[model samples]
Target: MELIKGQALFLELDKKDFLSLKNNDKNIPTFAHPKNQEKILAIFSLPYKNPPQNTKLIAFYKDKKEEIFIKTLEGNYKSEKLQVENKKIFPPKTIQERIAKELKEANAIYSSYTPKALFNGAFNIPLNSFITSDFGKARTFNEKVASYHSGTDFRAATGTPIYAANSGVVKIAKDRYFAGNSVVIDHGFGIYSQYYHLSKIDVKVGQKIKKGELIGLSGASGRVSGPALHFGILAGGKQVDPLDFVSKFNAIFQL
Candidate 1:
């Protein structure tokens, strides 16, 4: 399989003979089909930078193991420069503690794994609109600090409704330091979808959400140039291109 940086890969096989799976010598997570007992699902994603090369995916079933090859390719993304508030560009020393605390909290949630499949079938987009920013883009905030766009940005005006991309338990729904009014959903099996820079959040932490359900409204609440919805997806604990992850994940239905 050939994959670019920040892309997700999905595969499946009959569960009757499968016991476990491993990638790059590490134990990878697997999910049993929520409705089909005979199928097992596997998922993995690449980071925005410096992905591994010539990787191997090993599947263990009964007394035998099968190895599959994966070739990683570099992503082609352009750089962007924007002017935003200096506070967002360079947070003050007083807020550094808060930022660090939030980062730790978000990281712990993203890496945490749930064995069950909370969603079924294909995932949906949070908001149906034109994309303002694409994932993996190198962005310079106020022409100072540079960072990759970890999520896709939708062109949404304030008060535009946002929906859940998939069924999951709401892991976070609160005002975050850089995210502003954000909502993070745990779609089980270490996969998560996030909506950021919302003007109003209708969901609460720990709430059960279904695909296409209302979650929030968009706004320019975070460190952004204007009002928009920042949509992100994390698979197997790594941030991947949201739309690419969705398409890759949906392909499993045919298998």
Candidate 2:
């Protein structure tokens, strides 16, 4: 359980041309063939998912002084079909600039690198319910292009208590058009987790959250099939299964 192909978060110094990770080819980091080494931690180009079987994560910074071992981002993730009822998840025309602006804002938040590890060994489920929808499903609805499901959905009541997955700074706690009431927690080191489609929000932006602390209430808010809680784990702004993230932590700690 110590880091999977697509999911799991780790902290390391990333001097990757510092910010413009995707565009920094000159001073970028590269792998160094770590077969059976110690802990590993991430990247921008590869799918944030874990690497396939028997793969190793061996990376180094451009300076080569700070050896940042990362998970081999290249993975063998499969796709499954999904059905959505929404007709306007994508629009024909209107406010493209607004969406671009929001995308810019959100990317900035997720791309941020907090050097501290605000989280610990393991995390608790925000809700104690079963998953209603699985992650990484290829979804098609009213939109022209297909997209993959980014998170797991829990069967929840409208007012079911939602807890923070780990201790971190609350980067975003607001209502949105698609995510409904949403909360994004920054666990530092290019690691982040988010909860969406909430009925109520107890924490505010810039607030600090502890693992298992109440952050909101679950509900069917924006563009959802029903009343449920959508939970997500992100590595370098890429989505991976929440279960993959959680189970990896539980496995590594139990050993």
Candidate 3:
């Protein structure tokens, strides 16, 4: 993590404007760097998240040509270099085009919302299975030190039914490099739930999904040893232990 100078942070966009940029239909939003003083730096839009409080945002600067991390509290996060060059480039026309094309075919995965009623409600486990990997364990890959494990891993046979843990909008449902046949649901207030390594996606993008709805089936589609569901819950782009969120439900199982 690199500490950013205060002069490099944007102080103009208020909370409302910043939130609007994320929820708008626009593919990309205009970005202005505090360092450049007046020049329009880069344009990019992040995926929509519920309640607008849980989304992660970064502003790209043309001068450094890198993404400047921004937090919700008007503070600057350490600067991290863009791993991909296209991520650094302003006006990613080609990339945006590809995303647009893919969006048309992506299916909805699950629904999301920040219902006051469900904030404390217990999350329904999507499938009947044992946990293969516990949350918060240190993870190492290919001799490289990776970040701590972000989610829980539940083992199940391929084609095992996967259901929604709660209501939310289907945020992402697509096969990607690492998370194959994945689904993400935005559960409002920047809280999100994700199910990965799916064999099939049964939902479409932007569709409203309800709790206990069938979303997909388990599989070892990504980099995995066997069929499983990598279940994750994100709070404001940071991965917190799902155990913390669901601990209240532990006693209900015995009843």
Q: Better model by TM-score, 1 or 3?
A: 1
- lDDT (C-alpha, whole model) for all candidates: 0.83, 0.65, 0.55
Q: C-alpha displacement of 245 in model 3, angstroms?
A: 1.8
lDDT of 2 by residue, 1-255 (tens): 234444545333343533322222333222211222433333332343333433333344354434333445333344534475635566545556656766788888876678666776577788788987787665444432256667888889899999888889999898876678899998765668889999899999899889889999988888548899999887645676778767755554422
In the range 68-148, model 1's lDDT, one tens digit per residue, is 787887757776775654354566887998999999999888877888878856898888898988988876665432568
Number of clashes found in candidate 2: 5
Worst lDDT window (10 residues) for model 2? 27-36
Q: Backbone clashes in each candidate structure, one number apiece?
A: 0, 5, 11
Q: Tell me the spans in candidate 2 whose CA falls farther than 4 Å from its real position.
A: 1-45, 48-97, 140-145, 253-255
**Where is model 1 more than 4 Å wrong at Cα?**
13-16, 33-39, 80-91, 139-146
TM-score of each: 0.85, 0.69, 0.51
lDDT per residue for candidate 3 within 109-199, as digits (tens), equals 2223243323224577778778887665543344222334567889888899999887778888888645788898775544577898999
Alpha-carbon shift of residue 206 in model 1 (angstroms): 0.6
What C-alpha lDDT, on a 0 to 100 scale, does residue 95 get in candidate 1? Answer: 92
Name the candidate that leads on lDDT: 1
